[PDB]
């Protein structure tokens, strides 16, 4: 998500007018923040990927 | 251990070998799609923030 810089000044006529000028300006500093972590479940490993991983473990022995 | 190379470093090696200069072009093509979406979400959240301030 592109970061939001703090509300510069309360007041819509002037401060928010120049806050859109700043944040949305052609020349601006679009800093990034991450979203909060979404609960990813583990992907099930395909059987062929397990006949690749197991063949290396057998090469240990 | 930090000696173990991270996925980004392995992908960096892969990129170098398989496409040294075309990586920048792909960054540009994908950027066009990411920035437009993130700017849309930025403008929607900013409107939401001004609205919530007004409701306050």
Q: What is the resolution of this structure in A?
A: 3.4
B43, B44, B49, B53: CA torsion to nearest 10 = 110
Closest CA to A16 of B46, B52, B55: B46
Picking from B38, B46, B53, the nearest residue to A23 by CB comes out as: B46
Give the determination technique. Answer: cryo-EM
Q: Report CB contact under 8 Å: A30, B35.
A: yes
Nearest Cβ partner for B39 among A2, A10, A16: A2
DSSP assignment of chain B equals -TTSPPHHHHHHHHHHHH-TTHHHHHHHHHHHHHHHHHHHHHHHHHHHHHHHHHH-
Measured in angstroms, the CA of A2 and the nearest CA of chain B are apart by 6
CA triplet B32, B37, B40: central angle to 5 degrees? 125
**Residues of A in Cβ contact (< 8 Å) with B38:** 1-2, 30
**CA–CA separation, A7 and B46 (whole Å):** 10
- The backbone torsions φ and ψ at residue A2, rounded to the nearest 5 degrees and listed phi first, read -75, 140
Closest Cα in chain B, distance from residue A19 (Å): 10
Cα–Cα distance list, B56 to A8, A24, A25, A32 (Å): 17, 24, 27, 27
């Amino acid at each position: 998500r592109i970061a939001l810089p703090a509300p510069r000044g309360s007041g819509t006529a002037s401060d928010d007018e120049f806050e859109n000028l700043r944040i949305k300006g052609p020349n601006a500093v679009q800093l990034v923040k991450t979203t909060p972590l979404k609960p990813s479940p583990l992907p099930v490993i395909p059987d062929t990927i397990k006949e690749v991983i197991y063949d290396m473990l057998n090469a240990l022995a | 251990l930090s000696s173990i190379p991270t996925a980004l470093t392995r992908w960096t090696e892969e990129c170098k070998v398989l496409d040294a200069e075309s990586m920048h072009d792909c960054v540009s093509v994908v950027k066009v799609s990411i920035v437009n979406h993130l700017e849309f979400l930025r403008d929607e959240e900013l409107e939401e923030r001004r609205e919530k301030r007004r409701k306050q």
